[model samples]
Target: GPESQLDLRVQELIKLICNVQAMEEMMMEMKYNTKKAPLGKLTVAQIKAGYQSLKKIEDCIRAGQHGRALMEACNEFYTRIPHDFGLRTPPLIRTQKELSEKIQLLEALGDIEIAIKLVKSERQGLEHPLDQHYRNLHCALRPLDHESYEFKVISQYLQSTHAPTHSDYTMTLLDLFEVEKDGEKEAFREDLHNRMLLWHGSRMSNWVGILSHGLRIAPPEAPITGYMFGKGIYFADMSSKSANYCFASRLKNTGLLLLSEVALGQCNELLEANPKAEGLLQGKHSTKGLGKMAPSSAHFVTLNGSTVPLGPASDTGILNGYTLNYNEYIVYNPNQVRMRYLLKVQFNFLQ
Candidate 1:
């Protein structure tokens, strides 16, 4: 009943998230050995067997519980399609929302892969140039060099913010892009006032979907377990806290982070999680998860008319039930966030 389907580029992104070779099986079932022909010559029976393997993972995910059985299913699926989650172990789907988001991706990927196989078959093993598939990125990303003024200023802020955590980890900035996501500017409200540029993070696999779909709030039907302040687009004031969500493991050391401008006309600050914060957003534009160490309001910078809350982290004695160390702002309205900058940073996991 989900009418919306995954895009072609998004499917390409999924292929990058996992092992490129496993996706070969996804394109068309690969036979085990000498008794079999190559990929382009997949027999009908062989193709059916591979999808059964893929179906097992999604079916187990919908089976609604975690155990060694479910864990084993995940191992098979992942082993079938090895993901780029770095050198660390692949984790299990532990929650309903986690399952919801994940399975959605899986189903979309399955459909796209099926479509890809059929298309490849129609062409009868036709091939393109080596770099032919690399073009047509639906977004514009102009890189900013080290000598650029925007680079120096932004790089300075990124460095100064490094003061909060232990020096054991360093977020070495690699490339900065002046992102121009089409229609986001018009969709994003600037006149609503009290705008601030903030940090947002996500897994490597979601990058293509994120760029194509832009940032989105979780659907109402999605499970609402871990959304502390409600189901909305959440942004962070602390760099490390946001970067932690990148799911960047040891081998997958590099990740992408967004510098989004959020319009916080009036914020409803709370020391604890508000599951009903969506309804409680009366006379409030956004919800702020109150923190002991927050970005100071005094150093808020106004750049190109947007308030950059790019300030130093300072201590406060707010009673957060001992849960939080840094602050996160959640906006229930999607229009409140303006896509600003795209940053590619390498996480320095210095042991």
Candidate 2:
């Protein structure tokens, strides 16, 4: 009874993690230069303009030229996003990795901007602050049936593992949802029958943008080196491989994972790392990094006519100097993905 009650609290907090109100409060703690350009006052246009300035800064860095132009661009960027650099020399966004980090923050802030405005413009019965959050979370998330076939398959996906020794930690699926309009047809294509549900994970703060804006690709401005297979959305069959991107820890045991029906058409298989893979695959729709160990292909399940890799992880015995231990899939077009499921999971480290 105690364990069941304690588990209820865990479920409650997981929903709180999805609430935009909670996200806003978390973001409010971040150092934004709100004195000059307040968060509530920022427009989508200004956020777009900030990215243009960021690209210009990257351009300046590439040319190895430093002058008034660079400072002007940096000043314009900070003014648009209005971040506090602590009176230090505004850091140079030299690499795509560095630039990508800045882009992610601005993206999150842009979503926060929309949420804050929505909450302000619409008044709803003078609601309690906490109740408002519960309402908002429900608006975006619809809980899944634990007994449904979808639930059972995903649970098996979590339990089926290739880990030689799983004693270090346990990944428990606490909540599952069919996110609002995440699976709807828009830019996503359903022409192909090769769609397979796969895993994608990211930082906790990035979840707001993900829910609001949907999965996206690295912009043209980003350094190509940051992505091993050019600019695209990446996925994996192995749960723990993608979970690493969640950046979950012993203290913050909770993390989110998205399982999307990724349309992988004509995959160009590679046994080693290939930075130039995407560019080279002209006729191919996706790229796959073959692994030595993978989920059994025979046990795959089909949902909505899309393959769900529910196979138990096992050795493929393909020992040909493969660089990857777990299989990875990447699609160049964002339209090739339909994000179908979101899981709020617990990371337990018995160690």
Q: Pick by lDDT: which candidate is best?
A: 2
Q: For residue 310, what is the lDDT in candidate 1?
A: 59
lDDT of each: 0.61, 0.71
> Scored by Cα lDDT, where does model 1 land?
0.61
* TM-score against truth, every candidate: 0.66, 0.72
After aligning candidate 1 to the native by TM-score, how far in Å is the CA of 115 from where it should be? Answer: 13
In angstroms, give how far residue 113 of model 2 lies from its true place: 2.8
lDDT of 2: 0.71
Find the number of clashing residue pairs for candidate 1. Answer: 0
lDDT per residue, candidate 2, 19-129, as tens digits? 554454444445466666765676877877877778788678778757777777777887677666687766655666676667666766666675565455434556544
State how far residue 234 of model 2 sits from its true place (Å): 2.9
